Structure 1
Amino acid sequence: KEEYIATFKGSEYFCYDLSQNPIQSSSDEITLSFKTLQRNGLMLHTGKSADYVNLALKNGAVSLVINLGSGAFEALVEPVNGKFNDNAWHDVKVTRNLRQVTISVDGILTTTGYTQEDYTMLGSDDFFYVGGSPSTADLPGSPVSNNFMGCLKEVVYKNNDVRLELSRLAKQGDPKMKIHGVVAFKCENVATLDPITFETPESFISLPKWNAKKTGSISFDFRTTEPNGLILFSHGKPRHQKDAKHPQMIKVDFFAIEMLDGHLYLLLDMGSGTIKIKALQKKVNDGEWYHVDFQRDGRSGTISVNTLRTPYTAPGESEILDLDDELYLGGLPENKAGLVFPTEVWTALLNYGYVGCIRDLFIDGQSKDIRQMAEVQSTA
């Protein structure tokens, strides 16, 4: 066993079914560690009506609410000097024995209080949500509407009878555990969860050149409601002759991801022909998030959207994507010297620029803070 982690991006949650083995306890413990930059997000919740537990971040404080039917306990713990949404790990330990609740943060202090009136037992037969839920704001005792945005690890709920290793069950899988959204079982950078909006077709960023010619990967999440747009594009040095006078004569190693008429396509040329692939059958301009993953070794690889994956093999005997200079996200520059427009990229031929959100971009498995890039590079 190593530590079990996940990343939550605002629409991600775990759900554990409690119907077959519900909770009737007089003693409880909840432990986990969180890392975040958002002031508000549900960490976990478990009751549906009279009895409930809700642990959340509210205005940078850790907020715990526990009601056993006769009335609630509620408490917020926060440093005198600042907040807990500081992109640092924090451990939270929560214990409950009959009516007495205790919460310790970062093994620093312990706060102890009580639930009201007479009831002594926590009952929940519904769901155990981690990181979010379908409607967080309707959860009883919830002080937040937002789902978690950051990393959670080592989420564990135990009592005298049951121990639910909820992070573990998430990764490894269980008939009673269902997980939803764009979940990676890893924590890289919390800063990168913040989306970037391309508000007009003309807006775009220029990222760094791709690390190697022979292999590469690129992955990212996108959300969009427009039918056409150039999401990603890069090309090499031109291979046609100087006395070439027709755009069909253009020869250049290029890579592109584009949307046309609602459908998402990958386009790639390695020196010997252009291959073009409808990355998924359905239209993806419905405003929902999609995860995009592209893997390439030589002239073969894969392009995944969500969990549909598609293999591809490029023509030719060259195994090298000989990319040059810049890689463009969200559109193209107006006055770039030596910019080449392949004939197959209809998006670039018609100047369709992307409009939508991109989030959490990865090149060669290394996370990239595009926000730093956006602020630092012309906001367009």
Structure 2
Amino acid sequence: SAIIEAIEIPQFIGRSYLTYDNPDILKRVSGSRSNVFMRFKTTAKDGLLLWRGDSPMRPNSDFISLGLRDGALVFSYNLGSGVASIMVNGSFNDGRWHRVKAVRDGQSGKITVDDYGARTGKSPGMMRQLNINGALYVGGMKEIALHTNRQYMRGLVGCISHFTLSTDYHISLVEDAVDGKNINTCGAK
């Protein structure tokens, strides 16, 4: 027989998310340095890919975020003195896989999608450190509008195949999550 075995790729339907509270994971979403890699695909123009902020979310709370806006990828973060928002202008909601690398050291941030030209930006003020107490969310989150200060209204509609932090620290999306909502295999349903 031709039965294949493989590692599940999670699918998100807008009200879906995976949550991580593993200290070994959260410790890499904190401090002055951040390195996020993701491979994803979607047909929806908007959607949250990654988020970690404060709970309860306050107006000037720290956060780091990755998401889609009208097909464009937006890397955003607040370190305590203002938000950086760095966009790679594209139409990545074409239902094909795209890889995004988002890198930050202190205030300075950089995001590269596929082989398109990288875009850079900088958080204002003097704050250089991510000081966040919430769990790490992928593909969406519970009460997304409240917890992101209305920066995102829906989670991802699509799939996420790869998620790496610190260039080298692979996250097993399904197995490493402490919880999930409305998650199924990519392509099923």
Does the aligned pair in 2 maintain the 1:30–1:158 contact within 8 Å?
Answer: yes
Q: Decide whether aligned partners of structure 1 residues 24 and 92 sit closer, same or farther in structure 2, where only a CA change above 3 A counts.
A: closer
Report the CA distance between 1:113 and its aligned residue: 1.0
- Number of residue pairs aligned between Structure 1 and Structure 2: 177
Does the aligned pair in 2 maintain the 1:3–1:154 contact within 8 Å?
Answer: no
Cα separation, 2, equivalents of 1:19 and 1:40: 29
Cα separation, 2, equivalents of 1:109 and 1:46: 26
Q: Decide whether aligned partners of structure 1 residues 40 and 122 sit closer, same or farther in structure 2, where only a CA change above 3 A counts.
A: same
Which stretch of the first structure deviates more once superposed, 62-71 or 135-144? Answer: 135-144
Q: Decide whether aligned partners of structure 1 residues 125 and 19 sit closer, same or farther in structure 2, where only a CA change above 3 A counts.
A: farther
Q: Which residue of 1 aligns with 2:157?
A: 149
Q: Decide whether aligned partners of structure 1 residues 18 and 77 sit closer, same or farther in structure 2, where only a CA change above 3 A counts.
A: same
Q: Which runs of 4+ in 1 moved over 3 A?
A: 18-24
Q: Of the candidates 6, 11, 16, which is equivalent to residue 15 of structure 2?
A: 11
TM-score normalized by the length of structure 2? 0.83
Greater relative contact order, per chain length (Cα 8 Å cut-off, separation 6+): 2
Does the aligned pair in 1 maintain the 2:64–2:78 contact within 8 Å?
Answer: yes
Cα separation, 1, equivalents of 2:144 and 2:136: 12
Q: Which residue of 2 aligns with 1:179?
A: 180
Report the CA distance between 1:33 and its aligned residue: 1.1
Q: Which residue of 2 aligns with 1:36?
A: 42
Amino acid at match of 2:117: L
Does the aligned pair in 1 maintain the 2:88–2:118 contact within 8 Å?
Answer: no
Amino acid at match of 1:172: E
Q: Which residue of 1 aligns with 2:3?
A: none
Does the aligned pair in 2 maintain the 1:29–1:94 contact within 8 Å?
Answer: yes
Larger Rg: 1
Residue 91 in structure 1 maps to residue 99 in structure 2: yes
Q: Which residue of 2 aligns with 1:260?
A: none
Does the aligned pair in 1 maintain the 2:20–2:179 contact within 8 Å?
Answer: yes
Q: Which residue of 1 aligns with 2:187?
A: 188
Cα separation, 1, equivalents of 2:119 and 2:21: 30
Does the aligned pair in 1 maintain the 2:18–2:174 contact within 8 Å?
Answer: no
Task: For structure 1, list consecutive stretches of 5 or more residues without a partner in the other structure.
Answer: 190-359, 361-380
Cα separation, 2, equivalents of 1:178 and 1:155: 16
Q: Of the candidates 50, 69, 83, which is equivalent to residue 58 of structure 1?
A: 69
Report the CA distance between 1:125 and its aligned residue: 2.3
Report the CA distance between 1:3 and its aligned residue: 6.8
Does the aligned pair in 1 maintain the 2:12–2:139 contact within 8 Å?
Answer: yes
Residue 124 in structure 1 maps to residue 128 in structure 2: no
